[PDB]
From a paper:
Using this membrane recruitment assay, we found that a fragment of SPDYA (residues 61–213) that includes the conserved Ringo domain (residues 68–200) was sufficient for interacting with a short segment of SUN1, SUN1SBM (residues 136–155, the SPDYA-binding motif). To understand how SUN1 is recognized by SPDYA, we purified the SUN1SBM–SPDYAERD–CDK2 ternary complex and determined its crystal structure using a single-wavelength anomalous dispersion method at a resolution of 3.2 Å. The structure reveals that the conformation of the SPDYAERD–CDK2 moiety in the ternary complex is almost identical to that of the previously reported crystal structure of the SPDYARingo–CDK2 complex except for the N-terminal strand β1 in SPDYAERD, which is essential for SUN1SBM binding but absent in the binary crystal structure. In both structures, CDK2 is stabilized in an active configuration through an interface involving the activation loop (T-Loop) and the αC helix of CDK2 and one side of the SPDYARingo domain. In the ternary complex structure, the SUN1SBM polypeptide chain mostly contacts the surface of SPDYAERD on the opposite side of the catalytic center of CDK2, suggesting that the binding of SUN1SBM does not interfere with CDK2’s catalytic activity. This is confirmed by an in vitro kinase assay, in which the CDK2 activity is modulated by the presence of SPDYA but not the SUN1SBM polypeptide. Residues 143QTTV146 of SUN1SBM form an antiparallel β sheet with β1 of SPDYAERD. After the β strand, SUN1SBM makes a sharp turn so that SUN1Phe149 and SUN1Trp150 snugly fit into a hydrophobic cavity under strand β1 of SPDYAERD. At the C-terminus of SUN1SBM, the sidechain of Leu152 points into a hydrophobic pocket between the small and large lobes of CDK2, indicating that CDK2 may also play a role in the binding with SUN1. We focused on the SUN1Trp150 residue and found that substitution of this residue with alanine or arginine completely abolished the interaction as revealed by co-IP analyses.
In mammals, the meiosis-specific LINC complex composed of KASH5 and SUN1 provides the binding site for telomeres for transmission of cytoskeletal forces to regulate telomere dynamics. SPDYA serves as a meiosis-specific regulator of CDK2 and is indispensable for the recruitment of CDK2 to telomeres. Here, we identify a direct interaction between SUN1 and Speedy A (SPDYA) and determine the crystal structure of human SUN1-SPDYA-CDK2 ternary complex. CDK2 is a serine/threonine protein kinase that plays an important role in mitotic cell cycle regulation.
Residue numbers in the entry:
A (entry chain B), D (entry chain B): 61 to 202
B (entry chain C), F (entry chain C): 137 to 155
C (entry chain A), E (entry chain A): 1 to 298
């Protein structure tokens, strides 16, 4: 069976990513929730536990590569997901983006290429702490 | 201080949906 | 690859090259798919990630089995179960004699079984064509090439119109209307089913506006009752001409009364009223279904 | 009468602002057109001719202060317009934003406090060259 | 300021302090408004920019005239035409005797004239209260305090609900429904008109849900015919109680038949069916209108 | 190279609308 026990310390370390001022500014930027909605943010945590990311591996760059992978898998509009590049690669992203994609494939390798995140799983990770503001990030127009 | 569920068992972590 | 002895080249495209190969785990004949990694980004294509990520979780007897995934700095190999030939190569080989009706019935039943597994496990194939459906010498057909396939489980997700070949493309996508699902794949298999019987493509179009006209040539121009929201569409123009809907007896002469009933429900205009993969399997057409071996002679 | 003759060289110098990679990235960012739509971009040109900005005064910072003024005047949602700060003040905007507002008041002083830009005027400046992509930036939900 | 000799302090609020002052261009008695510049941002408030930017382009005899704008590093002064007192101070002074009907009629006609100029030149006052309406010794009333005022000309612009005092707040904003216009200001003047006659506020609420209940106490709970989209609203709940709509004869006893007809159309539930500033001026109520001097004795 | 109107006269540059 595809079971996994999620502990308090796993969700606490994941929510510490949103304590960074760069990350909170990035979520603010995405108003229409096109690239970083509740489901894509549910997906980024799922990828972290799948890759089995350690406390030291819970960095801002790792959050963006996992979110980009979630946008590669679930979002058909390829253009929208490119907004991730300047937030993790600075103001030289126009030539720094292929090395980010190499890391995205490296994470995809680390999760045994199992990048499909079901609705059931997303609703299950959301329910651990539904009071959190990142789950209050809903979409209306695809 | 943090108020999150201490232990959570996910019946379906890997895989696709069912309908 | 290394541990795979390349026998011969089979397929090729934008995606990459497909080979025939052996192994280190006996003479395990497989289908080794080499992926064309991007020139500038040098990253794995979105089509490859979607295909590998879905097939790593799809284990049905009527879906092509993924065996191994070799990923390196500049390479991406996909090990698949070897299947003698595709439907297109079999339809071309049986273009003058014709595929027998019990065998047509068997293949349609098998394809529906696999597609129902996809739709129940909320997966859209989005690329159902005869070249993308693989057959074997013991009478079994499988759904192949999940390159354009995606999981439709997660809500409010965005969807593209550039999905399947014109010939098998759904009219709700030909009329650029958003919010499509399971019904799109049904339209493609309905076109494949007709193609097996008449030995030729149902609507062989040359463009997008020509494809729609080929559909209204046979099934007739739709009214706001067969398709409730036919006029209220993003890519609709009043200049569209109204045409008569010829009877299915004329459309498919070798198919029986039950075969005509199933074909019509698969090629229904309204996606919300178009037959589902689950409902189509229950049809009285599959009452006298058997699993026969296909034709192969020297 | 409140008349003003707009020349080719006035609109050519204004469209050169969109040649900068930072500006084009900023317009890309604003997908829902909440802060930089055709009307707000019509308003930013109007403010430039009103302040009587010279060729050397046609800078990226001047574009953002004029766009912020247009958002202060025509947009009731005060929160949305704060996204302008990190694009003109870098990644230290959290304490660099009051000096930007001083410049916004300085421009408002330079235009004789006449910051009201009518629909008639906006449609008139848009019509000079309607083929331009910045006028193809329409809104749907306020 | 410098060139202005401060006589006395008049008004005060969150916006700043209002004074009485003279000049260098004779004993030109003016209203000098000092603006409270923000503590952290030290930038001009959005309310000040909107007020100055609108008044710099509004020149009507029933709109308070802006004379000069003094802006420095830490200061922002607004020179205005001096007007003896506001409507609230006059309604309080004539609270026992009462404002005469021809004078009530004169003020309403004058306020409507100015508001029609605003709405025709696509400007929303969004803050019509008696304290924000200024009178003079020669019988002329003016629209003052354009702090919450905005130009509604530009389409697809965003609008806030925190706009006017509860007592004069429109029900389409009390029920948090987006897309509001000219009609909001009409509701405030209709409440001001009634207040002048009955010598007391029409709907003196203590909260948002209490304000709505005060409106349905007099005008009754609305049905999907008086207000077509009353139930289909963002801030609607089925727990709202239905009430009887008492006749306007009871509501306003000193007003005549024509006065009751104008008041009802101003306090109409549907914003798309609520009287406009242009249509209200044409009413048979303003047929015997004159410009009388207000009461002032020692 | 640029393709923009050589001379444009704006009847209403300053002011509010009219309706
Ligand atoms: Zn949006
Ligand atoms: Zn949007």
């Amino acid at each position: 069976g595809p079971c996994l026990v999620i502990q308090r310390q796993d969700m606490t370390a994941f929510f510490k990513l949103f304590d960074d001022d760069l990350i909170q500014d990035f979520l603010w930027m995405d108003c229409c929730c096109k690239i970083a909605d509740k489901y894509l943010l549910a997906m980024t945590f799922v990828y972290f536990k799948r890759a089995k990311f350690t406390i030291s591996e819970h960095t801002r760059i790792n959050f963006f590569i996992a979110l980009y992978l979630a946008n590669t898998v679930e979002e058909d509009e390829e253009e929208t997901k490119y907004e991730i590049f300047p937030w993790a690669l600075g103001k030289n992203w126009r030539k720094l983006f292929p090395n980010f994609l190499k890391l995205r494939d490296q994470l995809w390798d680390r999760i045994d290429y199992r990048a499909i995140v079901s609705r059931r799983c997303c609703e299950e990770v959301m329910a651990i702490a539904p009071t959190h503001y990142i789950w209050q990030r809903e979409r209306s127009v695809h | 201080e943090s108020w999150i569920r201490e232990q959570t068992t996910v019946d379906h972590f890997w895989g696709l949906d069912d309908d | 690859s290394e541990n795979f002895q390349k026998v011969e080249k089979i397929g090729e495209g934008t995606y990459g090259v497909v080979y025939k190969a052996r192994n280190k785990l006996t003479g395990e004949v497989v289908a080794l798919k080499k992926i064309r990694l991007d020139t500038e980004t040098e990253g794995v294509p979105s089509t490859a990630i979607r295909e590998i990520s879905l097939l790593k979780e799809l284990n049905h007897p009527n879906i092509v089995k993924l065996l191994d995934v070799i990923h390196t700095e500049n390479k991406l190999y996909l090990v698949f179960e070897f299947l003698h030939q595709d439907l297109k190569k079999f339809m071309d080989a049986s273009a003058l004699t014709g595929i027998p009706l019990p065998l047509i019935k068997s293949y349609l039943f098998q394809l529906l079984q696999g597609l129902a597994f996809c739709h129940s496990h909320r997966v859209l194939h989005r690329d159902l064509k005869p070249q993308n459906l693989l057959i074997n010498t013991e009478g079994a057909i499988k759904l192949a090439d999940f390159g354009l396939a995606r999981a439709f489980g997660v809500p409010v997700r965005t969807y593209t119109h550039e999905v399947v070949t014109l010939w098998y493309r759904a009219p709700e996508i030909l009329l650029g209307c958003k919010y499509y699902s399971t019904a799109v794949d049904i339209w493609s298999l309905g076109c494949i089913f007709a193609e097996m019987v008449t030995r030729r493509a149902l609507f062989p179009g040359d463009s997008e506006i020509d494809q729609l006209f080929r559909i209204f040539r046979t099934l007739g121009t739709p009214d706001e009752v067969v398709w409730p929201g036919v006029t209220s569409m993003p890519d609709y123009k009043p200049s569209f001409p109204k045409w008569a809907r010829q009877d299915f007896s004329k459309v498919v002469p070798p198919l029986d009364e039950d075969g005509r009933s199933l074909l019509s429900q698969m090629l229904h205009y309204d996606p919300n009223k178009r037959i589902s993969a689950k409902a189509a399997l229950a049809h009285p057409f599959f009452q006298d279904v058997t699993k026969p071996v296909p034709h192969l002679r020297l």
